[PDB]
């Protein structure tokens, strides 16, 4: 794997730790006093790390983060597990809050209690039909399940001294801490891990000493019972015998300096790493129903000494069938078990083999973590840098690029699914086969089941456009796109703003009435017909009317620019294109130009103001005419004679009738992606912005020169908006408090 | 004496109307249940968000709360975050844990009083036509057959909205064993709200 | 000290030790009186009103344990019974007005939480077994402080909650509320209703 | 005290290097360093456990004390100077009063007498010190543990100094009862335990004979290599393993029970995995099998080898379990099989409750009824006839170290099986860690006790290594310094780092280690734990870093390979760079405190500033510019005897 990009600062050691997120965020402790303090990272902007202060006082050993997102717990090595949210929803701005401290060090896994949902990928067993089939929902339950059937959050923690620290997060706010010892022989636990086993969560707390001591599971429940929490334990088959302890090569490795369960939330398969001085040897174990009993599924040859182990973090069933075919198709990502060593290698394992599957020789990594599909690494170095190495599907086999594109395609598809990001998947894809994965996406998207198509309806356009950023045969399409999902926003939140009082006999909203006569009915090429055939009962109170004023200006100007943009004149694709020729988009924005009809009628201040040239022209009338032209044109489909030269006669004639304006378009910027290489490296800095390669596009409001007031800032969108909502207390507030969490492409606000 | 539920949408386009939607049918609520704000009258609460969360918990169930007052404090902070830019909030999952609260109340009651169950769906959204695929006691059965069955099990539910949809009104209907605002649709079951 | 100054005031402040000692009645913290209130009040057995600390003469470096509250003093003259007169000499108090002493306070509230304690240890299950004598003794001690507003029982059952909150258990809970009943039973005719 | 509580055995001259390093670094006149010396000893008596723990303060203090000060005087009027010291502690009635009550004989006449039998307090002294003592007694108003220990040092080590079953009744009257503690402390206290163990263990290696018919000359070597046994497997807990272990790795013998003490001997710190390729050598399981099972009397023992039936009983146990697991064996069979293993030679039995104890060590809760209550029955009387020739007195050592053994698992479930339950405690100092409660709390509780009284404990000693092992040298080092750093009286923090350097001597150099290296440096660089270095609590940091940087070094171009050697180097960068900086404060007094004390206690040992690196001595410069120091230290400080010493030096002097 080449590096995607690394980057470094600008200038005693302690152990390090990350966390990758459902969505791409890293947080990396970064031990440089600044050596207390949690990075986050963007992932697809590197270069604006925010360094939380993190208050706490000794080194930070354990970082975690929510199956959600959302959410990140610190504990250090004097207690404080500490809660980190998301403050006034910005991910750039985090905020301390519910907690809870004993003073001795947690020094094993904080892990976050589990929701019932797990997952599973059917990896090419079934890489070919549909959705449900391709990943399905495995039973497993919660950690107390709830009072009434939803799981409970909160966090188990061990600590030296084998305490356990349940801490429930009631729904109303305020924390239930409890703490009971792990065995009633209270005893050192060094190195110690937790995983949630599926049967009631029963989860289980593996805990070692140091060196030639048995392993020692464990097995917590947790008890809600008693308005009180309340933890149970009791003892599990311990596991002496590393198996290095016995080939009489006795103290050539002395310490466990790893044991990570081979998956959260898939127990019964414990790592260990022993090593020593210039040494180490790690093996898997399995518990066998044989009376339980571990014994080694797998185990490796010597090796030089590990520095950081990184788990698979993508659910993919282990069973032959599956696996076989994994061999077969060569589908490698979720098979993976990255060692990093002291000399300075990576090395891919087989987790069930424990064999190599491919190597980094490239100062080692002294924290590593996994992505989310086995697609990217993220290796704190040892001198203080950061690398996102990119894992190949298949592990550098050229194998036939219809397989590439079903691998991607089938990781794309769960992406969807489980909603989680697609950052890494966008590291690998080619500038080849960008239009044929869009292609291959429409296609899995038409056939699945016309119910789903809706879950889906706002996260395929966002692919679609983080797709098309590349392959520079079509960055034409990502404006158009990210205009689309901008324009279906305005219509399902100007379609829902109705409120009639007649629901005259039958079911009929008015937003659905609006569309069937703007549609079927009256396909008349003048507006005032339209306005006749609909109940003109359409009123909001004078100061909503008011407040969408900024709003409809936009659904103006664009009408404006598509019908000006039909004469081509641009020697290229233009920024208004696919919205000619055959869109439905023609019908929404004639359903948004009736409604702008209608309301202005009522108060004339929320109509779109264009800086007309003839004085009395009717310019809104003039546009509907267009409007109806081009979709009467492009409603019936076959006709590539929609430019008939009446058409574009007139539309030509437009800039001299009206003031052609000047929009935002929302890619806003190029990411990082689109820019890395194929091959070669990109060396970058902490806080300085790669060199070379003011609209409030959500409210559609001007800022100045300067802004002079805080902006939010799309991750992937680009998209930039005001951060204290600066209309007055009138303000719509069914689009404010729509984008308030997760912007229109569905990405995390950012600070300026 | 009887266990409400209530099931308000998460996030959609109700946060600018549920201020006052509040006071003139939720507070009289409560009223009725009480007089002017462990055994007996077990409030909850259960707000659904849009899809539009990549995994954020679909649903934030409360807990049964015997106090009133401490169901005013739930129902307040409700924060209507980022519904997205589609319509068709979840109500599928929403009545799926809704009836999964109901039962527990019954497992948990199983004592001399059977009481009437009244569950409140106050949401501007109409329903999503996805099975109930969060729940895991209910999957695969879409909202309509989640209105069969709440309406089977003999316990009356009342949609109020702040806006008159119909593909709510075929809901409530479809289910069987006022208004201080004229645009609102509030047709209530069991439970009396001052004319 | 300040960092310029050092081992200058450290080592001056540490050479008036061998005079504080001459100054310090050796075992001060664990002599304990005899609670007879004739003797009306002996100036040895006072305590600072504010600060539960022997009130000591001049500022020299005593011994580190005369700077710490004597919370054993105060519990073994609240202990014993008839000793009102004792504790009010002591702590100062003089019945003239509105007072709500905290430290006074507190220190009841950790006597009940001491007698809630004892009341464990297999209690003579079915009776006070000698425990009964607490309580017993702790209604009039109660009653006598709160009762002459020298206390606040609002303020007080507050901070027993606070306690007893993650302390370990009941077996105890009658007489705790054998003891609220009596100022309750005192004041629910005058006092206000909220308290 | 440390010396006494944990390492007896350990040797005189690592003491003696200890004790003149201390007298030295904080200059103590040598009177009161014995009468400190023989203060310690005797409060350790006085609280002690009742048992086997008071055979060791004894012994400790009336034969080991001795010798120290004996090689203290080789290491210097000393005797003038022991006078002094003994006329210091004879004016403390109380404390010598409470050891006569307990020792049950006038515990300083005896101290007396024995003091001046070596080469100390002459005898004049020892007349006048003694009708002192005895004019003091005047007015306060079965033989003595101490004569016993000053009687069975002599008699046992120049008697067993060098075979019939004349032997086996001198190791019976030898196993009579309390005369097994006494001999082993008095070996032990004077560097003997080793001979001693190995002369036992080469009677173990010879009485695994097996060449001889009759039952009679059988029966002896039988239960020879059973007394044996027991009486090396106790030296091996009580007085710690590593005693008896094999010195000199010829690699051909190794006897027996070198062997069974690496292989399953549970030791605190060894869990010894069962199903280990040396447990079950799966030779002959059959041999031992069918002579537990078909014999329905006492086992034939006419040429039993005992070489391979202690090690094959690992095995035999093993199996016979599963089978009784499985429903095969028959509860009243394996009753009877019990009885047999223990009807003859115990050895049989702690061998086989060892591999028990390790099999259930690694065993789920639900899967532990059978393997305990094996145990149950092994633990148990014999109740028969046609025993060995000494039986209570074996039966009362077996299960001595049955216990000590078994003590661990049997505190998880709880599983209380009792014992014969004299010595009223054979586990002192065991499990003292309250459950549910943090490490944190214990450390702070024990230490702030600690300050309370300036000697440390016997029972605090045992808390502090639990909470140095269950931890990290960095968690001790760390909260003990936050709580030296909270002190605000000047005579407390000096106490407190004159405690805590005893309470450090326990892994002395890791803590020296951790201490410096990722302490002083996280103090001396946040410039927000600036605050803490005030001046009361500062100097004493600064004279507790010096004096853990010199005994580091002084015990056992420079290699710096050594990681004390690499703190060292790093320190004294950190030192520059903080005295040669442009903001001054708490940080720049405590570095020049530290400076100040590693200049008063310069000794031979440390000569170059111990460890300035080869380009320090640019920093001498500096703590020129900012003396607030006479001169003369710096050559102290400079590296003298070299070539650009001679320029460095001078050129700082000149200033100063």
Do not use: G, H, Q
């Given at each position: 794997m080449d590096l995607a990009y690394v980057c470094e600062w600008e200038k005693p050691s302690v152990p390090l730790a990350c966390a990758w997120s459902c969505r791409n965020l890293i947080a990396f402790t970064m031990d440089l006093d600044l050596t207390r303090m949690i990075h986050i990272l963007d992932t697809e902007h590197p270069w604006d790390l925010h360094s939380i202060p993190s208050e706490h006082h000794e080194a930070i050993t354990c970082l975690e983060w929510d199956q959600s997102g959302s959410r990140l717990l610190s504990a250090d090595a004097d207690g404080q597990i500490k809660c980190w949210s998301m403050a006034d929803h910005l991910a750039n701005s985090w905020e301390s809050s519910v907690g809870s401290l004993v003073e001795g060090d947690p020094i094993v896994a904080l892990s976050w209690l589990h929701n019932g949902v797990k997952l599973a990928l059917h990896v090419e067993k079934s890489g070919a039909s549909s959705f449900g089939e391709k990943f399905s929902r495995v039973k497993f339950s919660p950690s107390l399940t709830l009072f009434g059937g939803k799981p409970m959050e909160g966090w188990i923690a061990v600590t030296v001294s084998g305490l356990v620290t349940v801490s429930l997060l009631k729904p109303s706010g305020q924390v239930l801490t409890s703490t009971e010892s792990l065995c009633r022989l209270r005893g050192r636990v060094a190195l110690a891990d937790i995983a949630f086993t599926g049967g009631g969560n029963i989860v289980v707390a593996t805990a070692d000493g140091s060196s030639a001591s048995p392993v020692q599971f464990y097995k917590v429940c947790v008890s809600v019972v008693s308005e009180k929490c309340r933890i149970d334990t009791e003892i599990l088959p311990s596991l002496f015998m590393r198996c290095t302890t016995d080939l009489n090569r006795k103290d050539k490795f002395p310490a466990i300096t790893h044991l990570k369960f081979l998956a959260r939330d898939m127990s019964e398969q414990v790592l260990l790493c022993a090593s020593s001085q210039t040494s180490s040897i790690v093996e898997c174990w399995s518990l066998r129903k044989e009376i339980l009993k571990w014994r080694i599924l797998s185990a490796t040859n010597?090796?030089?000494?590990?520095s950081a182990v990184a788990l698979p973090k993508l659910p993919i069933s282990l069973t032959n069938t599956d696996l076989k075919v994994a061999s077969d198709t060569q589908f490698y990502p979720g098979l993976g078990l990255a060692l990093a060593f002291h000399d300075g290698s990576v090395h891919i394992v087989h987790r069930l083999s424990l064999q190599t599957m491919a190597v980094f020789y490239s100062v080692h990594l002294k924290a590593m973590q996994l992505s989310w599909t086995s697609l990217a690494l993220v290796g704190i170095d040892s001198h203080g840098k950061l690398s996102v190495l990119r894992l190949s599907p298949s592990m550098g086999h050229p194998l036939e690029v219809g397989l590439a594109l079903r691998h991607l395609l089938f990781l794309l598809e769960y992406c969807m699914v489980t909603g989680y990001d697609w950052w890494d998947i966008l590291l690998h894809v080619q500038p080849s086969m960008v239009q044929s994965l869009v292609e291959k996406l429409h296609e899995e998207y038409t056939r699945q089941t016309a119910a789903l198509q809706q879950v889906l309806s706002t996260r395929i356009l966002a692919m679609k456009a983080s797709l098309c950023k590349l392959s520079p045969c079509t960055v034409t399409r990502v404006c158009d796109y990210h205009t689309k999902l901008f324009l279906i926003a305005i219509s399902s939140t100007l379609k829902s703003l109705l409120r009639p009082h007649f629901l005259n006999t039958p079911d009929k909203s008015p937003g659905d009435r609006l569309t069937e006569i703007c549609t079927k009915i009256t396909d008349v090429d003048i507006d005032k017909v339209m306005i006749n055939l609909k109940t003109e009962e359409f009123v909001l109170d004078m100061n909503t009317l008011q407040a969408l004023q900024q709003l409809l200006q936009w659904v103006g100007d664009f009408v404006l620019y598509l019908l000006a943009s039909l004469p081509n004149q641009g020697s290229l694709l233009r920024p208004g294109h696919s919205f000619l020729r055959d869109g439905t988009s023609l019908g929404m924005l004639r359903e948004l130009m009736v409604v702008i009809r209608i309301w202005g009628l009522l108060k004339p201040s929320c109509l779109p103001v264009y800086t007309a040239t003839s004085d009395t022209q009717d310019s809104m009338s003039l546009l509907f005419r267009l409007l109806t032209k081009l979709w009467i044109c492009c409603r019936d489909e076959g006709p590539a004679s929609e430019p008939d030269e009446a058409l574009v006669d007139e539309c030509c004639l437009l800039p001299s009738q009206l003031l052609i304006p000047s929009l935002d378009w929302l890619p806003a910027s190029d990411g990082l992606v689109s820019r890395l290489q194929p091959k070669q490296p990109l060396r970058l800095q902490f806080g300085r912005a790669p060199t070379l390669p003011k609209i409030d596009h959500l409210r559609r409001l001007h800022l100045g020169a300067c802004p002079t007031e805080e902006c939010k800032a799309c991750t992937r969108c680009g998209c930039v908006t005001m951060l204290?909502?600066?209309?007055?207390?009138?303000?719509?507030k069914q689009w404010e408090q729509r984008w308030i969490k997760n912007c229109l492409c569905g990405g995390l606000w950012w600070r300026v | 004496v009887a266990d409400v539920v209530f099931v308000i949408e998460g996030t959609a386009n109700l946060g600018p109307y549920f201020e006052g939607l509040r006071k003139h049918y939720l507070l009289p609520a409560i009223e009725y249940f009480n007089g002017g704000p462990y055994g007996g009258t077990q409030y909850s609460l259960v707000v659904f968000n849009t899809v539009d969360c990549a995994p954020e918990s679909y649903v934030q169930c409360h807990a049964p709360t015997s106090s009133a007052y401490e169901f005013v404090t739930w129902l307040d902070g409700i924060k209507f975050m980022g519904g997205g830019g589609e319509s068709c909030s979840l109500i599928a999952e929403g009545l799926s844990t809704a009836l999964q609260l109901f039962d527990d109340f019954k497992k948990m009651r199983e004592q001399i009083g059977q009481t009437h169950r009244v569950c409140l769906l106050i949401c501007n959204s109409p329903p999503y036509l996805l099975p109930a695929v969060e729940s895991t006691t209910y999957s695969g059965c879409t909202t309509e057959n989640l209105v069969q069955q709440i309406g089977e099990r003999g316990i009356h539910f009342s949609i109020v909205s702040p806006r008159k949809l119909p593909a709510l009104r075929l809901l409530f209907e479809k289910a069987a064993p006022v208004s201080q605002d004229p645009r609102h649709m509030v047709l209530v079951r069991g439970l009396v709200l001052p004319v | 000290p300040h960092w310029l100054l050092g081992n200058l005031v450290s080592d001056f402040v540490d050479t008036f030790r061998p005079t504080a000692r001459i100054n310090s009645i050796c075992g001060r913290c664990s002599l304990l009186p005899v609670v007879n209130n004739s003797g009306a009040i002996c100036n040895s057995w006072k305590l600072d009103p504010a600060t539960l600390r022997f009130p000591l003469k001049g500022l020299l470096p005593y011994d580190k344990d005369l700077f710490e509250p004597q919370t054993a003093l105060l519990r073994y003259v609240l202990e014993q019974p008839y000793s009102r007169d004792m504790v009010c000499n002591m702590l100062g108090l003089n019945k003239q007005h509105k007072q709500r002493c905290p430290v006074l306070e507190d220190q009841l509230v950790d006597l009940v939480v001491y007698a809630m304690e004892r009341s464990e240890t297999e209690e003579k299950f079915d009776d006070g077994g000698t425990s009964q004598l607490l309580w017993q003794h702790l209604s009039s001690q109660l009653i006598f402080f709160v009762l002459f507003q020298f206390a606040s029982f609002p303020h007080m059952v507050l901070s027993l909650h606070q306690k007893l909150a993650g302390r370990g258990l009941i077996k105890g809970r009658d007489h705790l509320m054998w003891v609220l009943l009596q100022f309750i039973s005192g004041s629910i005719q005058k006092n206000a209703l909220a308290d | 005290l440390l010396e006494g509580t944990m390492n007896l055995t350990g040797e005189t001259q690592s003491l003696v290097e200890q004790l003149t390093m201390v007298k030295r670094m904080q200059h103590i006149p040598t009177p009161l360093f014995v009468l400190e010396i023989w203060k310690a000893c005797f409060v350790g008596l006085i609280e002690s456990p009742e048992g086997t723990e008071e055979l060791k303060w004894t012994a400790f203090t009336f034969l080991k004390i001795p010798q120290v000060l004996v090689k203290l005087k080789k290491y210097s009027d000393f005797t003038e100077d022991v006078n002094c010291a003994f006329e210091f502690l004879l004016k403390l009635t109380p404390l010598l009063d409470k050891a006569d009550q307990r020792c049950n004989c006038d515990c300083t006449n005896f101290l007396l007498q024995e003091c001046g039998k070596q080469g100390l307090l002459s005898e004049a002294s020892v007349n006048n010190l003694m009708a002192k003592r005895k004019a003091d007694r005047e007015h306060a108003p079965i033989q003595p543990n101490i004569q016993l220990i000053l009687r069975a040092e002599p008699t046992v080590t120049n008697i067993l100094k060098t075979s019939p079953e004349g032997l086996l009744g001198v190791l019976g009257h030898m196993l009579s009862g309390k005369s097994l503690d006494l001999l082993l402390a008095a070996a032990a206290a004077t560097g003997k335990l080793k001979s001693f163990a190995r002369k036992f263990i080469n009677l173990n290696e010879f009485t695994t004979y097996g060449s001889e018919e009759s039952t009679k000359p059988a029966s002896v070597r039988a239960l020879l290599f059973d007394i044996s046994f027991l009486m090396l497997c106790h030296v091996a807990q009580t007085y710690g393993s590593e005693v008896i272990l094999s010195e000199s790795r010829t690699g051909a013998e190794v006897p027996f029970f070198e062997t069974w003490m690496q292989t399953c001997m549970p030791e605190e710190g060894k869990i010894l995995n069962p199903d280990h390729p040396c447990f079950r050598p799966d030779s002959t399981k059959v041999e031992s099998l069918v002579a537990l099972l078909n014999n329905s009397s006492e086992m034939k023992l006419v040429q039993m080898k005992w070489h391979e039936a202690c090690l094959s009983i690992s095995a035999a146990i093993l199996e016979i379990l599963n089978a009784w697991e499985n429903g095969v064996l028959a509860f009243e069979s394996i009753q009877k099989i019990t009885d047999n293993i223990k009807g003859k030679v115990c050895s049989l039995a702690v061998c086989a409750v060892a591999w028990l104890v390790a099999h259930v060590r690694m065993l789920g809760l639900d899967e532990r009824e059978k393997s305990l209550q094996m145990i149950r029955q092994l633990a148990g009387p014999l109740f028969s006839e046609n025993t060995l020739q000494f039986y209570n007195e074996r039966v009362v050592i077996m299960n001595s170290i049955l216990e000590r053994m078994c003590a661990d698992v049997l505190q998880q479930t709880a599983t209380q099986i009792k014992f014969p339950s004299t010595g009223v405690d054979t586990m002192p100092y065991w499990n003292l860690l309250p459950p549910k409660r943090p490490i944190k709390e214990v450390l702070t509780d024990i230490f702030a006790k600690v300050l309370e009284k300036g000697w440390v404990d016997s029972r605090s000693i045992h808390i502090f290594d639990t909470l140095l092992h269950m931890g990290g040298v960095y968690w001790f080092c760390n909260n003990l310094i936050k709580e030296l750093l909270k002190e605000t009286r000047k005579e407390h923090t000096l106490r407190a780092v004159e405690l805590l350097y005893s309470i450090f001597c326990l892994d002395m150099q890791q803590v020296t280690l951790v201490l410096l290296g990722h302490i002083l440096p996280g103090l001396l660089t946040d410039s927000s734990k600036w605050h803490s270095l005030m001046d009361p609590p500062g100097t004493a940091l600064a004279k507790l870093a010096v004096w853990c940087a010199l005994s580091s070094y002084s015990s056992h171009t420079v290699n710096m390979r050594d990681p004390l050697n690499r703190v060292l180097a790093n320190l004294f960068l950190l030192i520059s760079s903080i005295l040669g900086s442009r903001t001054a404060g708490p940080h720049t007094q405590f570095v020049q405190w530290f400076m100040e004390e590693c200049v008063d206690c310069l000794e031979q040992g440390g000569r170059g500033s111990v460890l300035q690196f080869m380009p320090f001595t640019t920093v001498s410069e500096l703590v020129k510019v900012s003396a607030m120091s006479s001169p003369k230290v710096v050559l102290a400080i400079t590296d003298l005897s070299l070539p650009l010493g001679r320029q460095v030096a001078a050129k700082a002097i000149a200033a100063l």
């Open positions: 010597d090796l030089d000494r590990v204290k909502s600066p209309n007055r207390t009138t303000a719509v | - | - | -």
